[PDB]
Structure formats: C-alpha cells, structure tokens
Design a protein around this ligand. Structure first.
Ligand code: ZN
Lengths: 62, 154, 58, 84, 50
RNA sequence: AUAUUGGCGAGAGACCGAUAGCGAACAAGUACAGUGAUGGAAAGAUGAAAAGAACUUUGAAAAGAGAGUGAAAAAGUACGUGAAAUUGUUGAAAGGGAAGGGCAUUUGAUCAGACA
RNA sequence: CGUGGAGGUCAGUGACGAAGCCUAGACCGUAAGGUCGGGUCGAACGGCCUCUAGUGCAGAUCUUGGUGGUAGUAGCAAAUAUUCAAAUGAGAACUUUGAAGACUGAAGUGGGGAAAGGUUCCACGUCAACAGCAGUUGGACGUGGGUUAGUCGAUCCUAAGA
RNA sequence: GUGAACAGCCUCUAGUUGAUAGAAUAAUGUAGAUAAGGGAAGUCGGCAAAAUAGAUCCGUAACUUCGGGAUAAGGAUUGGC
RNA sequence: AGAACUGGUACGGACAAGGGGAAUCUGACUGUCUAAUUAAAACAUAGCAUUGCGAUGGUCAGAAAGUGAUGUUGACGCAAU
RNA sequence: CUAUCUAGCGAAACCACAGCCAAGGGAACGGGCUUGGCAGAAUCAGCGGGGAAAGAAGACCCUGUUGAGCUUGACUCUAGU
C-alpha cells in the first residue's frame, strides 16, 4: 500500500531520524497493518524493522 | 442518440460514441480520418502499430509547422505524427463498436467504419501567467467522437 | 467501539451512498461550469493596470 | 523596487474588527472605526455616500423589535389576555 | 498567529463550520434550485479578512 | 386648505419583459477586490407528473449500445424553442501568384405554365 | 415599406400545430420588403382604418457576450541527477519498500519560533477539477479526530504617546 | 578537516532526490573556456577578458596637514621525508 | 628559526586571491538622494561669518481659548541665514 | 542548456481583404488600377529586404478666446502684523 505513515512513526519510536529506518521489503502485508504507534514496538522487537547503523565518518587520516 | 450524416442502413450497423473526452481536437480529427473506410481488423492493426512507432498517422489539415517524418510516405503526404493519446481514445471506441456489433448478429468478418467524426467539445478553462502581470487564458480542447460500424455487402 | 459511523445518519434521512455519488458528481460538474464562465470573462478585463510604466525611454 | 519587493513587507495589521459595525475597519494607531466612528456617539452618516446609506440603513438586518410596532399599532397597543 | 485572541477564535469556529458542501437531501426538496454551495471557500484562494 | 423619491397599508398603468426594468425577478448590497473610505457583479424557463431510465452487454471506471419511461429524449439535469460567427462528417463543384462582383451564354442541377 | 404598444373591425387564424428558426425551393414589388410550399417546433398571432413611440445599424480606438485565423505554433531550458528490482494498481520516467548514486555541508535543502495565515495538522476513502506533463500521490477532494497549564505567555506596571 | 576564518571545497547527525521528459548533436544563440605570430593596430573610449594575488624576507620615491603616501614601485622563496 | 635529502624545476600545485605607475579638472574626507533610466563635480558635513532676541521677548503654529512648539529652555542659548 | 524531431500540455502580439515583381501616373516611393515580363499543389529549418509591419516612443512647431506647477514693482484681493 503506502508506508509513509510507518516510516514517519519508526523515527519517533526509535530515536534515530527518518533516513535511517530500514523497513522490510518482504512483509509489507504486515507492516501496513501497524497503524498506531504501539504496534511498532511489537515489530522492532520482532526485527521486521531495523535501525541502520551510523554511516562512518572516520578521523584516521586527520 | 442522434448521429451525423449517415449513408447506410441502420438495421445492419452498430454504433459508438464518446462525449466530452479530454484529448486534443486537432489530433483526434486527424486520427479519426486516418481510419475512415477500413476494415475493423486492419484498422486495429494500424492503431496498434501507431503506438508501436511504425505506420504513422498522417496530419492532413491541422498540420502547420509540424516536423516531417518518413512513415507518412505510404499515405502520400510527408507530415506525419503519432498521437498516442488519441489513438488510445479511439481504439476504446472501436472495441466498444465491436461489442455492439456482436450484440446484433453482425459478424466481425466484414465490418468497416462507415461514419466517423469528431466535434469541438465545450472548452475547459484554466489560467496562465505571463510577464508584466497579465493573465491570459489557457484551455483544453476536448472532443465528442461519433463512430458507426457496418458490414460490407454487394 | 462505535455503532455510529459517518454513513449511519445519512442512510436513514434521504440520501444513500450510491445516490450520494450521483450527487457529489453533479456538484463538482456544476462547480466547473460556474468557474468556467467566470474565467470566460475576467481574462479580457484584467490587463487594465491603471498605473502602468511602459519601461522604454532612452 | 516599489512594487513586488515592497509588497512582501506587508504583515503588521493596521485595521482590526470594530465592535459596533463588525467589519475590519477599527483603526488601531488612533482608535477610530471608519465605517462608523466608534468612540464617537453617532454613526458616521453621510449624504455623498448615498449607496453607503443602503448598506447600513434601517430595514437591512434582523429588526428584532421594529418589525412588531407596525403590527402592534393596528390593534390599538392593547393589553390583557386574548380571550377565553 | 499562534498567540491569537478570543475575537479571532470566535470567528474561526464559524469559519470552520461554514466550510462543507451543501447537504445532499437539499437538492431532493421540491422547489429547490440550490445546485452547489456558492459561499463555500477554502484557504488557498480567498483569504477572509480578519 | 399645504408638502411627502422615507416607513406602513392599499389600487391601477397606451411603461419595461432579463444586455430591459432598481445594482439585485435567483441563498443581493450577497459572492468578490481594497488596509480603508468605498467600489460591486454574473446567474430565471425539462416535463402535465420525475413517471430522473429497472434489466442486458462491452469497459477498470467516466460512459456506450440496446431495453424502458414519455404525447416528445429533434424535452435526459450540460435539460423549451436552439439563430450567427466558428467546426466535423458526407455529397455537388471549382482551382498555374489572392477570393468576391457586372453584362451575355454554353454545360450540369432544380423549379415551371397547361395548352387536360 | 417595417417594428413595440393602444382604440375599432375582420362574429380573422390556431394543438388537425400559433410565433420563432432554417432552405443556391417558388411567386410579387424597381426597391424598402410582402406572400406560399418543405424540415424543426410547441401556445399564441396577424390584415385593414386609426393612435402612440425608449422604432429600423456596418462602423462610434462603440458597450456586453461569443468565436476565429495566427496554432497543435511560441514554448513548458537557473537552482549539478537520476537508476534498478519488487508491491498495490486498469494504467507507473512521477506512489511506496528495498538496493545503489548523489546533494544541501552547522550564516544548512536541519531542529524551534515571531508577524501573518486558519484547521492546511493526522488517519480513512477517492481522482470530475487543481498540482501549466503525469498520477493510485498531495498543502486538492468527502467524513470524522486533535490544542488539556497555580508556574510559559496575556492579564499587572510605566516609556514615547493616546 | 584544509584554512587565520562562520571564506570557498569535501564529510558526519538531520533532510531532500523537487523543478515535464525521450532521441538527436544542424545553423544562430545564453553561459563557461582555449590559441600559433603580433600586442590596442579594434573602438568615441582597453567596454569585456587576461594578468597580479595568500605567507615570509629583502626592498620602498615624489610630495606631505609629518598622522600618511604604502600591500607603493622592484626582487627571491614556498612540497615531502 | 636552521641544515642535508629527493623531483619531468613541481611546490598559496584545486579552492581562495590587489593590476601597477607618472600627471590634470573637480569635490576636502566617512555619509545621503532621484525605489522602477541620472550615485555625481549635487546635497550633507566640521570649520568661518552674519542677523534677531533679555522673557510682557526672538521664531512659528491655532478658527478661537484661561490654547500651544523652541521650553525639563535663557546669549558658551534658541531661532533665521 | 536551447533550438531541431517525438509523447503530453499548449497561450499571445497582430489582423479591412490578401500577398511575385519593373516602369507608369497618382495624396507627389502600389499587394490590387493600367500596359508588360510571367505563373503549378502542400510545404519544413533558418533569415531579417518589404508589409510606409507591431508598441500606453523622445521629439521639434502651431492653433485653442484649454488648464495646472512657479515667479514678480501685472490686475483685483486676503490671513498676519
Ligand atoms: Zn464600525
């Protein structure tokens, strides 16, 4: 359907911004039913959604 | 359910019509004169080829300053173009005319388009903005299309 | 936990959601016809900027 | 410029709603409505605004009381109950 | 603004109540010519002056 | 006795009939512009009655084609009659750098008198 | 000669179709214009003797309204830039998810405000119009939801002033 | 981070991928460049463009209201390990 | 701050960054204006000079008032140049 | 990046009617009139000769028993004093 509700919610429930939420490309028949907020914490613990790690800006040459 | 000038018998002819269709008018006239007098098999092969970028539609009347292409050579003229919106709006009416032809016993082995015409619909207006703060008009030119199919005989 | 929707009151008093679509389509067509005929007139008498400049002297 | 780049600065209001007439005409930097002078007593009536007298003259609005005096004269301004 | 008075919020309640289509059973009345709702407005086009 | 282009109640017209008559026959001093004083439109007509098209089929649907209502869809809400500029179709005809016009006639179309 | 009305007359015409409208169909008048036949059409309308006038259009950079040619033409070119697979879908250069590629580069294309706007905020449903291409998407469309203060503000002071 | 710098340039947290597109690479264009020899001969006129530039050291004249002129003019250097 | 080292004699290696000089008119300089054709040699300016006026006054406003401005002032002041 | 071609969307200036020229007279520089030379459909990209093409130019000059800004010992007045 249209997951632009859930990718907005998954920054507010996690704490990282919007651009770091990795939703699931295979379970969109299930993520689209997590309308309210307190079902997203039933999915982050399930691993349907994963916070991507911080892109590295090393300082080693500096 | 009044039609235009029809020189055929209205007992062996199915009919089709599309009103207030938001396509161009100067393109639908040219496409609806490309097919006037063709079988409903070669006509649909033609209107499948025009989208497939062979056998272009010739622009006879509404044709000033358009570019030249080679594929109008089979119709004689040298100004040809492929209006892919008006082809899609005419082919639906040909498909509707076949489904009305099959509801009267008219077999599809000898059908041809007898009476086909476009008409300047009521304009649908919008506005555009030019320099120095002046509103000029900016309108669409929709078309009514009428189309009667009938079968060839002796 | 509702037994009341949007449609629950209006299905009883007159209209029906199939005929509501046959009413909603008629207003948006008549809104077009009343907004077409205003732009059929205002485009003529709108370039009359009464304090123009004509910005070309020397 | 004096046109479009000087139309962007228009944000602070200089008229606010009046409490007697109810249109956006109550000036604020000197506190006086322009469709009827509000801290003055009488409404701003004028004879050169002959169309403006029709926009606020009597007979326009509700007349919660003045559309009963015509009927109440015709029965002698009478009192007491109707009948049995 | 977001720091509005009450004179503005008294009026925006009526401005939010007067923004809806005409009720659909009005057109099914007998001597009713009211096709659309003419005084209807939205915030894109016609700013109400307050 | 006199005056009265305001309010209220009446009665009439060698006046106008929707580009007229008040700006307004209609949810008009409304919609709308302007900070504001003020400025201020357009917009009436299905039918006797909605009897506003059940049903079938093509289409994703807008709708189409049947069927049906109707005295009339050449009255289907875009609804009396439907003019012209302008445009499509088919038919007739003509055309070496304009088209149109005047006088005469050939040819092609159509009309004719009865002299039944 | 004609037009809008008014007084007589024709015991005028008319739903078995009155005005109007169309006709390289006909006739009369030098003409102004009158009369007939056909198609459409559906409720009124002429002749003669008179009376009256807001009475005859090609123009007025005429007024209002409508539509042309120009014309599918001018063009839709600032801001570095998009690509692949899948998903719903009638339909996807444009919606979403993933995967890459980028950019803003902390006086930001970020996070909050003040003026001003006023429900655009958010969800569900939907594409006739708008988004100068598209569209299932949207600040659009339809219906509902939402703003919680003893402390943060106004309220209370005084300035220039009124 | 380089840098004296909140310059310019690149990168992280945060955000966006919006501005009609496809093919072709003609003339004329708008923008951005380069050039042999000559160096204003162009033109009303060096208009426009190119040059010089940052830092350190040496080096600085007329005139002067002794404050300036002055970054005057004119020279050399610059990496990495 | 200094020395040996090494190179396609490169080296503020992109980014960033003064063209310079000798004379003449005119304005002293910093600033301001013709928003939307004129940024200047115009205006302003400090400096210099003049005039009125000792308060019941100078200059100016008000239709008038028991009314005002300079004046919460008083010639090293106010007003007009 | 335009332009060119294609998909989609798609206005305006302007317009009596329309466009081959040479001489001729002529409102004194014809697209039409008059003698001539000629003349083949629909046309696309460029172009700036013509259409005395298109614009709410800057003009110089005059008349009007037409105003306004402004100046004085114009005429006739007036606040103030
Ligand atoms: Zn008021």
């Amino acid at each position: 359907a249209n997951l632009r509700t859930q990718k907005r919610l998954a920054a507010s429930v996690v704490g990282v911004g919007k651009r770091k939420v990795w939703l699931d490309p295979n379970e969109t028949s299930e993520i689209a039913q997590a309308n309210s907020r307190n079902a997203i914490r039933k999915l982050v613990k399930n691993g349907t959604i994963v916070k991507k790690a911080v892109t590295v800006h090393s300082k080693s040459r500096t | 359910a009044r039609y235009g000038a029809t020189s055929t018998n209205p007992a062996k002819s199915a009919s089709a019509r599309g009103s207030y269709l938001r396509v161009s008018f100067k393109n639908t006239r040219e496409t609806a004169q490309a097919i006037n007098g063709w079988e409903l098999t070669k006509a649909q092969k033609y209107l499948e080829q025009v989208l497939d970028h062979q056998r272009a539609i010739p622009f006879r009347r509404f044709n000033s300053s358009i570019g030249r292409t080679a594929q109008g050579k089979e119709f004689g003229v040298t100004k040809a173009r492929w209006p892919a919106k008006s082809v899609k709006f005419v082919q639906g009416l040909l498909q509707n005319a076949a489904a009305n032809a099959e509801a009267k016993g008219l077999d599809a082995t000898k059908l041809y388009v007898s009476h086909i015409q476009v008409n300047q619909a009521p304009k649908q207006r919008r506005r555009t903005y030019r320099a120095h703060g002046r509103i000029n008009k900016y309108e669409s030119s929709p078309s009514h299309i009428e189309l009667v199919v009938t079968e060839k005989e002796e | 936990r509702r037994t009341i929707t949007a449609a629950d009151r209006r299905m009883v008093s007159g209209v029906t959601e199939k005929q509501y679509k046959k009413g909603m389509k008629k207003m948006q067509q008549l809104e077009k016809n009343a907004i077409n005929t205003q732009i059929r007139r205002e485009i003529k008498r709108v370039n009359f900027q009464t304090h123009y400049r004509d910005e070309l002297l020397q | 410029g004096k046109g479009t780049p000087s139309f962007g600065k228009r944000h602070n209001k200089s008229h606010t709603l009046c409490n007697r007439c109810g249109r956006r005409s109550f000036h604020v930097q000197k506190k006086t409505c322009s469709s009827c002078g509000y801290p003055a007593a009488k409404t701003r009536s004028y004879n050169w605004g002959a169309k403006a007298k029709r926009r606020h003259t009597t007979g326009t609005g509700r007349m919660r009381y003045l559309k009963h005096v015509s009927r109440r004269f015709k029965n002698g301004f009478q009192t007491g109950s109707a009948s049995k | 603004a977001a720091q509005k008075s009450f004179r503005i919020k008294q009026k925006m309640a009526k401005a939010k109540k007067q923004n809806r289509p005409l009720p659909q059973w009005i057109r099914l009345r007998t001597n009713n010519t009211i096709r659309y709702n003419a005084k209807r407005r939205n915030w894109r086009r016609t700013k109400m002056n307050i």
